[PDB]
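User: Can you write out an input/output pair for a complex, sequences first and structure second?

Assistant: Here is one pair. Inputs:
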Amino acid sequence: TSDMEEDKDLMLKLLDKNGFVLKKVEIYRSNYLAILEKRTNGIRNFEINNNGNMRIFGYKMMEHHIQKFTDIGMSCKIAKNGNVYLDIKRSAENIEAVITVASEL
DNA sequence: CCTGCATCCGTGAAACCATATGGATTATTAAGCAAAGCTTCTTTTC
């Protein structure tokens, strides 16, 4: 969707803004991937699904980071190896909120 | 030397340095996978 395009525009705007460099930005399963450079704060990528949900996924994230993203109301799915899903709705205010909580981790 | 007594031994009721090193542990990614979801063909209903 073009809303996913514009939310990609503000996403790269606020990740490029806040000094969080990217490994690669990928359209994969027709979904966006704002992948972090290193596994910083136990986080892998800042992805966008086309199903109205931008998602933050990681590997062995600390609990207090997860609490900081449930401050802005995000779902989580831990795995058996430390893989953690973080669901939020894809919107510009959620772009600003997720990248401003990620910008203070 | 060999007969004759004694006994006695068995026997059961500290700290460190240094240097590899590899094996153990952790992260990271490709594969795959079950589950879901289009696309058309029959099947059942009025």
